[PDB]
Amino acid sequence: MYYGISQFSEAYNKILRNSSSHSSCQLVIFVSCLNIDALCATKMLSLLFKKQLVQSQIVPIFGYSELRRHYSQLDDNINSLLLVGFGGVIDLEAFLEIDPQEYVIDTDEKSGEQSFRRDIYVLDAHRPWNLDNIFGSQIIQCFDDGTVDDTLGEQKEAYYKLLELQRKKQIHEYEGVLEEYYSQGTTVVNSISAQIYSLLSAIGETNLSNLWLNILGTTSLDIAYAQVYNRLYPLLQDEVKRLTPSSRNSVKTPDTLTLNIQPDYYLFLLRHSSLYDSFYYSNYVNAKLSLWNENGKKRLHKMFARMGIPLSTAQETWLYMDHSIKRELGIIFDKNLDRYGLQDIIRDGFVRTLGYRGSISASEFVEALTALLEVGNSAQKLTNLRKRWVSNFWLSWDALDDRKVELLNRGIQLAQDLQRAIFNTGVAILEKKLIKHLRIYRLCVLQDGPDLDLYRNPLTLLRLGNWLIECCAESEDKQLLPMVLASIDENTDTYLVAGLTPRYPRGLDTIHTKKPILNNFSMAFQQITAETDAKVRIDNFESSIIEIRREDLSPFLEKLTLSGLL
Amino acid sequence: DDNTEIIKSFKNFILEFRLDSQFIYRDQLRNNILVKNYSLTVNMEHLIGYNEDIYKKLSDEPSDIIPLFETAITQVAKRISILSLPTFQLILNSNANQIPLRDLDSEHVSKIVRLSGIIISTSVLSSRATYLSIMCRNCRHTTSITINNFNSVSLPRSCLNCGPDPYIIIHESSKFIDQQFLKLQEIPELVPVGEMPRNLTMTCDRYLTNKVIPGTRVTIVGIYSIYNSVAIRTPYIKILGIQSDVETSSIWNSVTMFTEEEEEEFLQLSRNPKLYEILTNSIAPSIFGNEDIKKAIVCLLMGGSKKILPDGMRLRGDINVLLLGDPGTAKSQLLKFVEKVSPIAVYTSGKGSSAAGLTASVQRDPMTREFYLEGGAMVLADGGVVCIDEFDKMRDEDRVAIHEAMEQQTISIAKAGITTVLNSRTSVLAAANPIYGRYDDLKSPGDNIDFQTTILSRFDMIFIVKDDHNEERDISIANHVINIHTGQEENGSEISIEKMKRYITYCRLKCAPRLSPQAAEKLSSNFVTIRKQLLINELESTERSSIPITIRQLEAIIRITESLAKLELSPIAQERHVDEAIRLFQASTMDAASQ
Amino acid sequence: MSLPAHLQQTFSPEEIQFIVENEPIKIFPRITTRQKTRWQLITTDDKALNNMVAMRSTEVVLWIALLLKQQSKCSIVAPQWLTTKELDRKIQYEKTHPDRFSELPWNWLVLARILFNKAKDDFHDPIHELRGKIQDLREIRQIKVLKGLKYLNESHLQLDNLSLLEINELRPFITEIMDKLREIHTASL
Amino acid sequence: NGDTNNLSHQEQEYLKEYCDLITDLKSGDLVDIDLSGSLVPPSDVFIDVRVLKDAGEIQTEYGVFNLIKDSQFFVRQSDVERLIQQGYLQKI
Amino acid sequence: KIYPKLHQMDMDKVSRVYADLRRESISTGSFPITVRHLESILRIAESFAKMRLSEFVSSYDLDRAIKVVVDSFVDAQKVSVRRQLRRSFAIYT
Amino acid sequence: FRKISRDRGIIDKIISSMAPSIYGHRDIKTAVACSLFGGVPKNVNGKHSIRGDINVLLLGDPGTAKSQILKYVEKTAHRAVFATGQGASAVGLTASVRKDPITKEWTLEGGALVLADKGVCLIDEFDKMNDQDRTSIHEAMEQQSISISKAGIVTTLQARCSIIAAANPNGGRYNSTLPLAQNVSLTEPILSR
Ligand SMILES: Nc1ncnc2c1ncn2[C@@H]1O[C@H](COP(=O)(O)OP(=O)(O)OP(=O)(O)O)[C@@H](O)[C@H]1O
Numbered sequence A: 001m002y003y004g005i006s007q008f009s010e011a012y013n014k015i016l017r018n019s020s021s022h023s024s025c026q027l028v029i030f031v032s033c034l035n036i037d038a039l040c041a042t043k044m045l046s047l048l049f050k051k052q053l054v055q056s057q058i059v060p061i062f063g064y065s066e067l068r069r070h071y072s073q074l075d076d077n078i079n080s081l082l083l084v085g086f087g088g089v090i091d092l093e094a095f096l097e098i099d100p101q102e103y104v105i106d107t108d109e110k111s112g113e114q115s116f117r118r119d120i121y122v123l124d125a126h127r128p129w130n131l132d133n134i135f136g137s138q139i140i141q142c143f144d145d146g147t148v149d150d151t152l153g154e155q156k157e158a159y160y161k162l163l164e165l166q167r168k169k170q171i172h173e174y175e176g177v178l179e180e181y182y183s184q185g186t187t188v189v190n191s192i193s194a195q196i197y198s199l200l201s202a203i204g205e206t207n208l209s210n211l212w213l214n215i216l217g218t219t220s221l222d223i224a225y226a227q228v229y230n231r232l233y234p235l236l237q238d239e240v241k242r243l244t245p246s247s248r249n250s251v252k253t254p255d256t257l258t259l260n261i262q263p264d265y266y267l268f269l270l271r272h273s274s275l276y277d278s279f280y281y282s283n284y285v286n287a288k289l290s291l292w293n294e295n296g297k298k299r300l301h302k303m304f305a306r307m308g309i310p311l312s313t314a315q316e317t318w319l320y321m322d323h324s325i326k327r328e329l330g331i332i333f334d335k336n337l338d339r340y341g342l343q344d345i346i347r348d349g350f351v352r353t354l355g356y357r358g359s360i361s362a363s364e365f366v367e368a369l370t371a372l373l374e375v376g377n378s379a380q381k382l383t384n385l386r387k388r389w390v391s392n393f394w395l396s397w398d399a400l401d402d403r404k405v406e407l408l409n410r411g412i413q414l415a416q417d418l419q420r421a422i423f424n425t426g427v428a429i430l431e432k433k434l435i436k437h438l439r440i441y442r443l444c445v446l447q448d449g450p451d452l453d454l455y456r457n458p459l460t461l462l463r464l465g466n467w468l469i470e471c472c473a474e475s476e477d478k479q480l481l482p483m484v485l486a487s488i489d490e491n492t493d494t495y496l497v498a499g500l501t502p503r504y505p506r507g508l509d510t511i512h513t514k515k516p517i518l519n520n521f522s523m524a525f526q527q528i529t530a531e532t533d534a535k536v537r538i539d540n541f542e543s544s545i546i547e548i549r550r551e552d553l554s555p556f557l558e559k560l561t562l563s564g565l566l
Numbered sequence B: 001d002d003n004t005e006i007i008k009s010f011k012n013f014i015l016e017f018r019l020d021s022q023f024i025y026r027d028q029l030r031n032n033i034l035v036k037n038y039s040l041t042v043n044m045e046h047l048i049g050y051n052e053d054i055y056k057k058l059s060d061e062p063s064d065i066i067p068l069f070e071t072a073i074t075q076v077a078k079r080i081s082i083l084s085l086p087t088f089q090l091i092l093n094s095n096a097n098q099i100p101l102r103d104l105d106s107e108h109v110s111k112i113v114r115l116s117g118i119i120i121s122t123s124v125l126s127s128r129a130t131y132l133s134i135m136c137r138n139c140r141h142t143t144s145i146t147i148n149n150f151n152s153v154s155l156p157r158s159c160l161n162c163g164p165d166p167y168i169i170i171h172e173s174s175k176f177i178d179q180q181f182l183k184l185q186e187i188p189e190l191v192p193v194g195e196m197p198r199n200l201t202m203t204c205d206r207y208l209t210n211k212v213i214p215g216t217r218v219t220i221v222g223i224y225s226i227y228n229s230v231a232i233r234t235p236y237i238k239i240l241g242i243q244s245d246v247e248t249s250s251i252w253n254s255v256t257m258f259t260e261e262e263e264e265e266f267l268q269l270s271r272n273p274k275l276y277e278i279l280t281n282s283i284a285p286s287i288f289g290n291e292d293i294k295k296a297i298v299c300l301l302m303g304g305s306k307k308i309l310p311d312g313m314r315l316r317g318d319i320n321v322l323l324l325g326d327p328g329t330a331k332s333q334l335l336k337f338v339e340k341v342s343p344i345a346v347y348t349s350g351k352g353s354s355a356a357g358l359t360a361s362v363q364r365d366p367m368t369r370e371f372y373l374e375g376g377a378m379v380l381a382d383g384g385v386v387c388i389d390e391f392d393k394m395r396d397e398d399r400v401a402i403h404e405a406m407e408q409q410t411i412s413i414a415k416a417g418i419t420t421v422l423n424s425r426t427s428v429l430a431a432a433n434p435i436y437g438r439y440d441d442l443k444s445p446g447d448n449i450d451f452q453t454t455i456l457s458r459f460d461m462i463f464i465v466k467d468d469h470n471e472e473r474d475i476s477i478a479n480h481v482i483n484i485h486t487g488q489e490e491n492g493s494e495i496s497i498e499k500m501k502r503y504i505t506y507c508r509l510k511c512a513p514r515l516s517p518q519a520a521e522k523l524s525s526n527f528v529t530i531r532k533q534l535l536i537n538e539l540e541s542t543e544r545s546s547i548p549i550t551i552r553q554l555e556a557i558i559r560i561t562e563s564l565a566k567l568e569l570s571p572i573a574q575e576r577h578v579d580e581a582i583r584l585f586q587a588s589t590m591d592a593a594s595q
Numbered sequence C: 001m002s003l004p005a006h007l008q009q010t011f012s013p014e015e016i017q018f019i020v021e022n023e024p025i026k027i028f029p030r031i032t033t034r035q036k037t038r039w040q041l042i043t044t045d046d047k048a049l050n051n052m053v054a055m056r057s058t059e060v061v062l063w064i065a066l067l068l069k070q071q072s073k074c075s076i077v078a079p080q081w082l083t084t085k086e087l088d089r090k091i092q093y094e095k096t097h098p099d100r101f102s103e104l105p106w107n108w109l110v111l112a113r114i115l116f117n118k119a120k121d122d123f124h125d126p127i128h129e130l131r132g133k134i135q136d137l138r139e140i141r142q143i144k145v146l147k148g149l150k151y152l153n154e155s156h157l158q159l160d161n162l163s164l165l166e167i168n169e170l171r172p173f174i175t176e177i178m179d180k181l182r183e184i185h186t187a188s189l
Numbered sequence D: 001n002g003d004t005n006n007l008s009h010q011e012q013e014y015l016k017e018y019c020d021l022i023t024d025l026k027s028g029d030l031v032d033i034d035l036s037g038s039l040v041p042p043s044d045v046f047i048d049v050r051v052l053k054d055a056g057e058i059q060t061e062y063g064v065f066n067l068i069k070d071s072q073f074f075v076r077q078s079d080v081e082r083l084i085q086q087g088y089l090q091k092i
Numbered sequence E: 001k002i003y004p005k006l007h008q009m010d011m012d013k014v015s016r017v018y019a020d021l022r023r024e025s026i027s028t029g030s031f032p033i034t035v036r037h038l039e040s041i042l043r044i045a046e047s048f049a050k051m052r053l054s055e056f057v058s059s060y061d062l063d064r065a066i067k068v069v070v071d072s073f074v075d076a077q078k079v080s081v082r083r084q085l086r087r088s089f090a091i092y093t
Numbered sequence F: 001f002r003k004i005s006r007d008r009g010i011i012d013k014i015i016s017s018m019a020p021s022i023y024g025h026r027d028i029k030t031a032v033a034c035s036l037f038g039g040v041p042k043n044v045n046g047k048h049s050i051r052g053d054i055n056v057l058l059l060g061d062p063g064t065a066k067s068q069i070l071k072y073v074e075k076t077a078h079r080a081v082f083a084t085g086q087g088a089s090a091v092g093l094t095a096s097v098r099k100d101p102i103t104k105e106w107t108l109e110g111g112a113l114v115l116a117d118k119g120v121c122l123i124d125e126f127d128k129m130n131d132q133d134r135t136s137i138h139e140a141m142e143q144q145s146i147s148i149s150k151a152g153i154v155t156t157l158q159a160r161c162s163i164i165a166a167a168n169p170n171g172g173r174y175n176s177t178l179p180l181a182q183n184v185s186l187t188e189p190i191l192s193r
């Protein structure tokens, strides 16, 4: 079943009613190991359950194989299971071999409903919903954000009729509409943290820390699904305005906590690096100036000279920069940026300050968390790598506590290192012209890079993919074409392919830009794997990322080009 | 007027600054006053966080506001330590970008700057005045003056008839402080193309004196100012803080500069069962093979233990290593690494050196016309290692000028009245080529070595590195070098240079093992056998051995044993170390002599 | 042996906190337990807990009060000595009497640390001001202790109005130094 | 609760029978108290803990704990105090 | 402005030419061969890459550098063995 | 300079343009071009230093256009210094130590290799040099640095210079029947550089 926006309180009350007894623990939470939104949502839920004294267990999980293993290994004393960041698309009842009869506790003929020992709650933002979980199952309870009621009526009707069943014509047309619904690609439509914050507001537990976590979760989608962030921004603005004290005339104190809405910028770690490095290592700036070649550096130096900022001053760190220029930055940027085409750098963001400490923005906090996740620190090696990433999850989780600031600083340093490495790898890719421009998609395979050990993590591979997507692909007035990025690792002799959705020119509101673009690589990849003896691993939660053997990539890509479903 | 408000503002920073639940500066002040260290180190990132306006003033006019932050510190210290004390020093820490030494120019005058360099000289401490008591010549009127050492002061010109300049200082009632002068040279890599390195004069006060020694890289925070000595002024830097990677204070006095938390790490590392392997692998990670030379370098860095007998005789505790071999063997690279890992080291070329360049030289002061002594390479490297490259190009006299400093560890001078015996306790690591460039096996060993027996006997271990063309080894070296060219373990198999250097310092200042009787009996039997082996070899060939085996080699074996024991913080040296020492001696010196 | 070497002859700070957390404190219940199950304790009195009424002052043990506050079911009423004005008065008393300690409670430091950590929204004065005042008082008392340590002797010594945490800090130094002095004196005879 | 090559055989016998004595003491009238328990006073009732080394589903007296490496619990200190002592769990 | 970098190279080719050079240079009086010349090959390859203002060293550049070094080595041999040496090294030139 | 360089045979039109007034000697011109463009220096992890410049030696017969090639390289290089066999000294190359006439204190002067930092030092009549003067450039030719310990000065300089040297074989004419080692008086360490 599915719980409407207003049923979150009912679901929370059910969880408290069932899995709350000081004798033993009866709650378990599974989290996507490499999703920041799920991390923040689970932190919010952990605080909420700590307040009410509910004993729980949190298990980081990478891939579906680990999910199946851990669910099989669960004890029978667990009354409620929480899945955050996955499970919506797959068939949980079929995948986990859940037989409703075995899990039934008591059945009432008069009520027409059955009671089950276990309950499974799905907190997923991906789409489309698997109609089996939403409408067929009862053990599975899915936290909806209105989609089922807004735009799933016809699918609901078709599925219910199909279960209910000259008739061949009706049956055919109903399976046809169901297949049409299943044919579309995958996309993210909302943020889980927003859902948990709505629950908290429903039960009245919203405070400043919860709002900070909600803002982090929501802003983690800004880079990819900007169209979700743009839709959720007004609610965050209203919440910040409502929670903030009216009077700010009071002076700073060692305990004062501030949460403002100041002008932010599309610059990489502006407040923890030089003004030069923020422009140099920015996706948008590199896209609009082509910094990977010497002409780009010359153009950036020209821009700085025109703005009236000495090169020595710009390269100085943020804290010690000359304060006249720091104060005038808003005026200097606004007249100068439009000329170089970097005008959209101007933006409004969230900045949080703890008394007498440096102020940090939401975007930089998310960047630090992601960097800690990525580089924080036959089948045996794969298991070891996944264990290391599960370990990094806890570093990133600790970095969310104000008592742990050294971890956040360590994350910022690692983020700067990682961005430098990604810049170098992208420069090497573009200089050699390794991108092949086929008619269905673009391809780029790395075979001998200098820093190829970095891209075994899906997060770092997606970072490089976003960098490439923005530069010389978003711009150049070329047709929108999806891109495939693959990388090799000699230690295991396999590829980590990763399809990437194209993105419209940033900050260009238009009717066509309003429409979202889906990711069809999951369907094509699964079809090809089923048809060919691929040996592909499709266990990753993001269905667009798989693993291939060294000698199968050429047949796989040939069949991909010949498929035409991309 | 404004001065009182500025003082009030800096006093509220020291009394109201908390980052969590601890008052960092109030507690730092109380703890410093309790041990008699009248100063406060403030981080400028914390001041930019309390009130950015206070930082704007301290950076806009540094020599006017710094004197007003010292008096605020003094007032707070009196409030905190005295229940109803000289002016307190302010030491600054900053993370601003470092300006290259040669980029300092008119645009940085009277501003706070951060820079790095190498200290080449330090002066004898002078005495500056901080509170004068004065009197008048004629009417005998008493007054006092108060001086801060921040220049943009002199005795009053007119009394308070009395002629010009009527005041004479009363010394028995005045108070003074300490002042030192330092010369800072820019780092060799920073220097521009085809330019000699440039110097800069620096001065430090009170608790920033006697913090550095010549030849140590430092980072400096100070004020770039000018003093008149026509319409030009000679620039200099007024130090406000010194940061160095070398614990010079620990090295000159006792063991210091190691935190208990830092000390715990060193003990844990020493407890590692295979520390020897880790240290051997940590030296020159980018040079393939040559394991024996790397073990020898570990022993040389560790050093032996020195003894002063009751009768007064002193026994050398340092190890000297010679590397003779063919070109392309990576001897120079090993020397350049050892210069970089050791806490104190000097890299010198035998060709571009001289007898006075090494040891010490007599120099005349152009003003006082008085001769004084300036230390050379072996004095500048005292307590460390000297890397004499191109040891074969050195002239006979300049090489002869090294015997006493290598063996007795002293530099006797008798020149221009100056008569003394300096101290030079250094380890020599030398690299050389044979006479013909390549060690030619056809000719006798006495033909490939021009070094005399006296100089050679002073080396604990002699390595005759020969380059043999073996296809397997050649392929291995080619693969390693190509990997180096196209291309971080740090997983218990190698430790960075900084950690290794700190561990060397800790071991040197913490341990000095001693031989147990079993080791003594073993080493004594081995010496008798080796001497017999040289005699059997000599009887066979009319020629007298070119590589000698004297008592110095027995002492060298003892030193190697003691260094191996010291490597693991073991107070006693057992046979497990004697066997390794004998193996190394056989691999280097008996190997050289056998040929 | 059975007892570690750092717990011999003295208490640890956690032991002092444990001792302090048994003293009564005043709370404002946010629930009405009084009837118009039931607590059953054996180490303290349970009548007060069984008789609670919303927004009615009552006294319970400090650890029970902290446990209730963790649930947002009671608001601790801070002691009267922990207001700004009272701390100013105590600071003045310390300043004017160089030879004596003020009459602060024997648990002022520990209770201050506990309440600042746990109940930050139950004070009627800004927390930063109270932290500053407590810091000042601590510094003055530290000066007085340093001055008074110069009178250790082989006979008794008196430190009146010195709190529990300060005595715990100073117990080893004072006791061992005075023991050595007594040993020397006794050897003399 | 109650390497060895370093000890001499006499010390080995001493240690063995002293552990026997400690267990005998623990078995007496002080059973309700865990004589070889923790000497730090109990401060918090519920603590967050992390699994430090992987192990099966250990079945302690207080309940069943699925000790998956890198997984956190919100439990009562009293229950998991032994596991923390052995090293299977960490307080964080 | 140009600093070419070695990324994609046939390691086996360079290793095999270096070993061949060493073995053939074992002869008395021949031009010395050490690791310095193995590094000289890469230096010359980087120089050739620089001549084209290219940011990455190509396979053709490495082949040309190997040819340069191998020829310079062969020319210095005596007349008697020059023909044999040239025949033996014809693979790389 | 970036159209000329995408063309396909620049690497060989550059070799052709080296001293075009000399008829042949393709190998000499190729070596000169390689030395002029030079390799890339690299510091591995900040611990290992690898030279990045190419040194060339011309060992030929009397009238074979060697000095002319050296003069052309002097013309074309950004920073070049020309030295002849016995007109150069051990301290003339590298660095020397003098007593400043004004301050009357020891100081350091830069020699040929310092003037040739990031440049080329062209030594003619290389085989007629004094042995003492010839052995002086050993450290500079590999480590790219000059170390001086004289008169109380202990400093290390930077000499990032390539050396192109012309020499004349023993007897004035190369004897192709003998090995190279017998036809020159240089030794293994200098030759290997
Ligand atoms: N494993 C190695 N073995 C030998 N040489 C190496 C190795 N790795 C690098 N090299 C190269 O060695 C060169 C340095 O020369 P090296 O120190 O070997 O000379 P040397 O034999 O000590 O001196 P000389 O040739 O004057 O006798 C550098 O070019 C470095 O690239």
Ligand SMILES: Nc1ncnc2c1ncn2[C@@H]1O[C@H](COP(=O)(O)OP(=O)(O)O)[C@@H](O)[C@H]1O
Binding pocket: F021, F022, F023, F024, F025, F061, F062, F063, F064, F065, F066, F067, F068
């Ligand atoms: N291959 C050649 N092409 C053009 N001129 C040459 C050639 N070989 C020799 N010469 C002539 O020889 C003269 C230079 O001789 P030079 O190189 O100074 O002798 P050495 O080789 O002893 O230094 C020039 O005038 C030049 O024209």
Ligand SMILES: [Mg+2]
Binding pocket: B331, B332, B389, B431
């Ligand atoms: Mg050398």
Ligand SMILES: [Mg+2]
Binding pocket: F066, F067, F124, F125, F166
């Ligand atoms: Mg000539």
Ligand SMILES: [Zn+2]
Binding pocket: B136, B137, B138, B139, B140, B141, B159, B160, B162, B166
């Ligand atoms: Zn007078």
